[model samples]
Target: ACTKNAIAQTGFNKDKYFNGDVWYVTDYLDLEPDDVPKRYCAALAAGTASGKLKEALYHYDPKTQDTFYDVSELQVESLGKYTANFKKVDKNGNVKVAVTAGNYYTFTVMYADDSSALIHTCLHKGNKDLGDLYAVLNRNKDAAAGDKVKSAVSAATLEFSKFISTKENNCAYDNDSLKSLLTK
Candidate 1:
């Protein structure tokens, strides 16, 4: 699993029409480009859980009349300003194990306000824990809940970081360096 946090200035521009300051939360994964469909499906599932989308790509509860959110619309509006692509490779050309085109996945929710911005992203690969967490966070988002989503994201990140650290001998490196190394 991978977690990413970002802050950006916002305005009425096409890219920042949502709020003044923007926060981006997401996870990283590695997958093949040809597997975009699988990745897309996973993303949709996560988005449904994250409350970003009304329903999963294949599963829809018409009786509940869940409305689907336009992810493409969000991506188009977010173009050039933030991470819109589902798959991003490192400098070394190594696929990020945390994020893959189809094998791994990420779900991001952005919090924007006039003062500061906060974002939470959850990443996973066939892991139910992350998916469940995303679903809970999505519910909170739906209620226009307070900082619960942010808090949950933070907790998940910390836990995931700890897990990764344990798995990789507590490797510590800057983002650029890590990216370069992975790409190689």
Candidate 2:
């Protein structure tokens, strides 16, 4: 079950964070593995469209060449906390699965800067809660996490060493598709 009420960034800047740009998940810490693979790549573009807060997600497995995309409409819970209803989509933004009441994720921005960020999420599907997931993100896919984000991890009582780095997985992203998916 998902636990921990992760703190949000102090005075989080929504406009800057949701600049309609892609953010690569360089590292991730999954509290409960479940049936998920050990190695994976993920990224997202957070933005607003038609006056709605939205996010587009990309997930990949470099080892198995598996890939998927999601588009979410985020509802604000607080300054940096959101409840996102996600719909599975194709790279071109074609809906593969519509959003249902059972499919949603709780998102919290723990920290953020111009180039880097730290976020926490807990996903729920059907009767299953996927547990808490913390991710370190960077604007550049190849960029390493900086000190600020690292300290944020420590401040959250998490060990930076526990995170799995996606860089070693030979992960590649479709930036063009991700950017365009923002409006979809």
Candidate 3:
């Protein structure tokens, strides 16, 4: 029994990684962070915490496995160029995580409602969806996949903008399926 008023401008918080199980395909996610990278598309690879995803987080295949991960011990330097910007808007059902690491790269990912469903839409289409970007340090860190990841991140941001713009039922919810996949 959720309503439009229930989801208006609800802030999920800042800097907390969207931890979830990594296994679903043809999925969708909630995304549209209050703060996002200058230009980068991002998404998660969800899986049950204690399942195959644990190992997948370490050395996952960029072309095969689901690359999202657990941020239980994720460390971001709050003292240096390791500046991080994280935010989520429930009205739009989105969370943009941009943790820039020096002059090298950034741990960039977009998380939000319905993400769990729309994720695989791009992948299954044989197109480079957000899942192509490996979570954590799992990414290849090269120039090729680098470019691909960037495109997906940007696409994710654009989609968020569209979601918030629905004149009628925005299709967003009070948390219908967007859940915290992190384990205790």
Candidate 4:
């Protein structure tokens, strides 16, 4: 299985990897470090895809091990290969499936105390309702903008949590499950 191969190559313990957490740091957000080479070596050994590894390298930093942005939050409003479908029930007990919509949110993983960490946020969809919070702060040069953006993004993320929980029953996909499917 890919998980086994990934573990053997990367030296990442599956039991210790996700363990109910959602994300892991694949890149750096702060400063470039010399240890990056060793990190890439470990990733290669773990069987990570070359593309993913490359992304990590491109986004890697050395000063902060947990520095990184959430890519999912950057793709909001775009029709995604992953989606959630809704269903409606009529008074007579008829069930109707609603149109499928794409996911506009993403998850981020960081490390806290050498353990894994995660952060969830929504992306900009070019809508006034969903303004580009990241951009707003970056462009406005607002000192408090970071806090405001975090709050706005947090709200958007909560909306997604509600949508997924109620409509999709919290279905999700991950590397291990995907590997299992391929092996089968």
lDDT of 4 by residue, 136-180 (tens): 112111122234333443443322122111111111223243222
Error of 1 at 36 (Å): 30
Model 3: lowest-lDDT 10 consecutive positions: 1-10
Cα miss at 136, model 1 (Å)?
17
Which of candidates 2 and 3 is the stronger one according to lDDT? 2
Best by TM-score: 2
**Weakest 10 consecutive residues, lDDT, candidate 1?**
162-171
Q: TM-scores across all candidates? A: 0.26, 0.96, 0.22, 0.20
Put the candidates in lDDT order, highest first: 2, 1, 3, 4
**Per-residue lDDT for 58-104 in model 2, tens only?**
99987788899999999999999999999999999999999999899
Candidate with the larger TM-score of 2 and 4 = 2
The runs of at least 3 residues in candidate 3 whose Cα sits more than 4 Å from the true structure, single-residue gaps closed, are 1-20, 23-72, 76-106, 117-184
Instruction: Kindly give the stretch of ten consecutive residues in candidate 2 with the minimal lDDT sum.
Output: 32-41
Candidate 2 off by > 4 Å: 34-36
Better of 3 and 4 by TM-score: 3
Model 1 gets an lDDT of 0.27
lDDT of 3: 0.25
